[PDB]
Subunit: 453 residues, 2 copies
C-alpha cells in the first residue's frame, strides 16, 4: 500500500470533494524550508499562501522549533482551569495585551480561530445576561465574511459554501452586505457613497430587528477567504458610528490580518478600527502550533467576571486553552517578528508585490488587482466591461491556480480571484519569483482562453 493509497483509504479531507479525491488522490507535501515546500516527488513550490495565510516565519524557523523543545522538556502539557497557570501563557498574555492597538483587559486562549469566534459568541451572550439585557443577543456579520466553521462560527461566516447543506445559519446570526466595491457598488458610485449605503443598510437592519436585540457586529478588517476584499474608504469609520449609536460591540476578526499582514501590526490599525474584542490566530504562532487568542476590553471582562462570581465559576474552557507548548512557540514567534522588524519588512515587500502585479492591470482577463500590505488578490474575468466570468464563475481561478502549481507556486483560488499571502520573511528576489510565476500562469491561462479583441 502506497502513501497516496493510504490517504485515499483512510482520510476524509477538509475542503475537498471526497469523490474527486478518491480518483485523483492527494498532493503529498513532504518537507518545508524557508518560503518553500516540497512534494514527495522532490518538486519545490513557493508557498505563496504561507500554507493557510499563516506561516509568517516560513517553514524552517529554528527558534520556534527550539522554543517548543525547551517547553516540552519543562512542562509539555498543563491547563489553566481552576486557578492553575503556567509561565508561557502568562508571558504571552502580557505581550498580547501590551501590544494591543486599543486598551485591552484580558486574554482568553483557544486552539483555533473557529473555537475563538464560537467562544466570543458565548462570551457576549454571557455578558449581556450578566448586565440584565437578556434580549441583547443577535450578531451581525457580512456576506462573504469568514469567521470559522463551528455550528455558531459558520453562522457568523457569510460564505454560502460553509452553510449550504449544514442547516446554517442558526437563528440570530444576521448578515449585511459584502463591502466589495468592484462587485456591489452601483454604476458610477464612489467608494465613500458605497460606504454610506452600507452604513444605512446596517442601521436599517438594526432598526428592523430592534436595536435592543443586537449585541455585536463582527468583521475581518479586510476579508481573507472571501477574496482579499479591501473595504471601501470610510467604511469602518461609518460602520463603527452606527454600532456605537446603538451600543453594539465591535469585534475585529484578525485571524488573517494579525501580526503584520496588512502593513501595520493589526488590521485594526490599518483600517482605523477601535474594537471591543479582537480574535487572533494563524500568524500568532506561524501555525507551528494550534493556538488562537481572544482579547477582551475592560467592560467585557468586568461583566463576565461578575457573573462568573455569582455562578461559582466561568463554565467554559478547552483542554488546550493556553497549552504551554503552543503559548511558548507563539511567544517566541512574536519576539522574532519584533526583533527582525518584520511588520516594516512585510510592508516594503507588499509594495513590491503589488507593483509587480500592476504590470498586468490592462490585461483583458484582469478585472481587479487588490490588497494592502503583504496580502493581495488578482480577480480574473472573461470580460472587463461586464465583469462576467469566462465560462462558469471559478473557471479562471481554478485554471490559474493549477498553472501556478505547475510553475512551482502554491496560490489559492477564491472563485476567480487568486490570492497572495506569502511568509513575512519573503525577500525581494522571492517576491519577484512569485510575480514571475503568476505571470507564467496568466500567460498559460490567456493562451487557453484566447481572448482575441
Amino acid at each position: 500500500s502506497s502513501l497516496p493509497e493510504k490517504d485515499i483509504q483512510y482520510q476524509l479531507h477538509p475542503y475537498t470533494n471526497a469523490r474527486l479525491h478518491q480518483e485523483l488522490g492527494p498532493l503529498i507535501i513532504e518537507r518545508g524550508e524557508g518560503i518553500y515546500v516540497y512534494d514527495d516527488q522532490g518538486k519545490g513550490y513557493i508557498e505563496a499562501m504561507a500554507g493557510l495565510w499563516s506561516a509568517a516565519l516560513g517553514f524552517s524557523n529554528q527558534r520556534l522549533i527550539k522554543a517548543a523543545e525547551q517547553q516540552f522538556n519543562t512542562l509539555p502539557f498543563y491547563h489553566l482551569f481552576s486557578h492553575k497557570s503556567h509561565r508561557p501563557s502568562i508571558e504571552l498574555a502580557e505581550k498580547l495585551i501590551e501590544m494591543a492597538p486599543v486598551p485591552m483587559s484580558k486574554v482568553f486562549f483557544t486552539n483555533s480561530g473557529s473555537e475563538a469566534n464560537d467562544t466570543v459568541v458565548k462570551m457576549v451572550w454571557y455578558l449581556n445576561n450578566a448586565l440584565g439585557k437578556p434580549a441583547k443577543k443577535k450578531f451581525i456579520s457580512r456576506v462573504n465574511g469568514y469567521h470559522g466553521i463551528t455550528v455558531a462560527s459558520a453562522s457568523l461566516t457569510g460564505l454560502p459554501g460553509n452553510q449550504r447543506g449544514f442547516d446554517l445559519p442558526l437563528p440570530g446570526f444576521l448578515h449585511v452586505g459584502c463591502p466589495h466595491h468592484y462587485r456591489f457598488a452601483l454604476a458610477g458610485e464612489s467608494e465613500e457613497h458605497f460606504a454610506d449605503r452600507l452604513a444605512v443598510e446596517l442601521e436599517q437592519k438594526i432598526l428592523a430587528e430592534g436595536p435592543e436585540t443586537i449585541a455585536a457586529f463582527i468583521g475581518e478588517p479586510l476579508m481573507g477567504a472571501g477574496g482579499v476584499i479591501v473595504p471601501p474608504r470610510t467604511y469602518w469609520e461609518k460602520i463603527q458610528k452606527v454600532c456605537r449609536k446603538y451600543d453594539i460591540l465591535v469585534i475585529a476578526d484578525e485571524v488573517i490580518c494579525g501580526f503584520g499582514r496588512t502593513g501595520q501590526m493589526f488590521g485594526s490599525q490599518t483600517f482605523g478600527i477601535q474594537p471591543d474584542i479582537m480574535v487572533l490566530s494563524k500568524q500568532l504562532s506561524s501555525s507551528y502550533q494550534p493556538i488562537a487568542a481572544i482579547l477582551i476590553n475592560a467592560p467585557v471582562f468586568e461583566g463576565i467576571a461578575d457573573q462568573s462570581q455569582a455562578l461559582g465559576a466561568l463554565g467554559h474552557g478547552f483542554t488546550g486553552s493556553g497549552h504551554p507548548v503552543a503559548t511558548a512557540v507563539a511567544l517566541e514567534n512574536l519576539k522574532i517578528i519584533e526583533e527582525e522588524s518584520l511588520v516594516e519588512h512585510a510592508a516594503q515587500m507588499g509594495q513590491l508585490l503589488r507593483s509587480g502585479l500592476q504590470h498586468f492591470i490592462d490585461h483583458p482577463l484582469v478585472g481587479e488587482i487588490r490588497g494592502c500590505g503583504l496580502i493581495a488578490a488578482v480577480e480574473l474575468v472573461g470580460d472587463r466591461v461586464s465583469k462576467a466570468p469566462y465560462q462558469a464563475l471559478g473557471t479562471l481561478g481554478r485554471y490559474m491556480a493549477g498553472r501556478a502549481q505547475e510553475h512551482g507556486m502554491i496560490t489559492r483560488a477564491m472563485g476567480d480571484a487568486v490570492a497572495f499571502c506569502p511568509p513575512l520573511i519573503v525577500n525581494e528576489q522571492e517576491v519577484g519569483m512569485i510575480v514571475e510565476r503568476f505571470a507564467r500562469a496568466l500567460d498559460d491561462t490567456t493562451q487557453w482562453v484566447g481572448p482575441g479583441g
Copy 2:
C-alpha cells in the same frame, strides 16, 4: 511585576471564579516529570487527573518530545485542504482505522474534542440532508454528559454549569436521564431494571418527538467530567436496541475513555458498544499536542462523500486539522501505548486503586465509590442514609480537592465527588500514595465537618 501579578492582570481563566482569582491569584505550575508536576515554589504534586484526564504517558515522555522535534525539522506546518496531504496525518489515520473496535471507514481530524463533537453535529445534519431526510436532525444526549463547550457541543453537554448564563442548550438538543444508579434508581431497584427504565425513557422520548426527527444518540461509555458515572449493567445493550429500532446513529464519545482508560483500549469495548461514529482526543497524544479525531463508518462516509461532490467540496475544516506535529506526536504516543502494554498495565493499576479506595467504603462521609479500569471517583455526602450534601451540593468536594492539593495531590471535584484519572504509567506504590493522599484529605474533611 511578579508572575502571579501578571497572570491576574492579563488572563481570564477557564473554570474559575474571575473575582476570586483577582484576589488569590494562580497556582503556577513550573515543570513536570513522570506523574508529577511542581509549582513555582518547588512543591511536587501527584497529578492524579493526568492534567485533564489526558496525560497518558505522564509529563516527561522523551519519545513524544523527539517525535515532535523530528517532524518540526521536516515540515512544521501544513494542511489537508484541497487534496493536500502529508505523511503523519496519513499514517495516524491508518493506525486509528486499523485499531478501531468496529469497522470504520474514515478519519477526520480536529484540534479539540469540542470541535470534534461540533463537527459530528454538522456531519449528521449534512448526511441527512444528502439522504433526503431534512427533518432527521435532533440529537439525544444525557443529563451530566460532557461533550465539549462550543455553542453546539455545550448543547450536547448535559451539565448545568456549562449552560447556565450561556442561553443553552440550542433547540434540537434533547436530554434523557443520567444513568447513575446511586442517584436515580428507585428503592430496591436492580441495575438491570434501572437500565430497562432508562431504555423505556429513551424510546418514549423518540416517540414523543417523532422518530423521523431523531438523527443521533451520543454518549460517553462512562461519563467522565460529569462524575465518573458507570452505567448500570445492560444499559448500553438495551439503549442500542432502541437506537437501531428507529435508525438512530450511535455516537461513542471516547474523549476520556479512549486509549486504555477503562481496562480495554476503548470504552466501546468495555461496555459492548458498536458505534457508527467515535470521537477521540486527550490520551490520543497524551495532550502533548491539541489533536482530536472523528472515526466514521462506511454509511456515514458514503452519504457525506456524495454530498461533497454535489456541493463542490466539503465546506468544513480547521487550519489545524491533522497538523503534522500534532499527528506525528499522536502516532508515536499510540505506538508507545502498544509497545509498553499500557492497556494491561493500567488495568492492573486500576484494580489496586479501586481496592485501596474500597477500604473507605464504611466511612461516614463516603456515599459511593465508583469506577472501572483506571478511572474512579469517591462521592462524599453529609448523610449516608439520605444522601444529602453537607450545607449545599459541592461544599465537600471543594474542601476535599483543596486538602488533596495541600497533601501533594491534584484531583478534581465534580460536585461532591473527587476524581482519579492518573497517567497510565503510574506504578503500584504511586497508586498507594494517591490513596494515602486521598485518605489524609478525607480525614481533614471529616474533622472540618465535625461532630
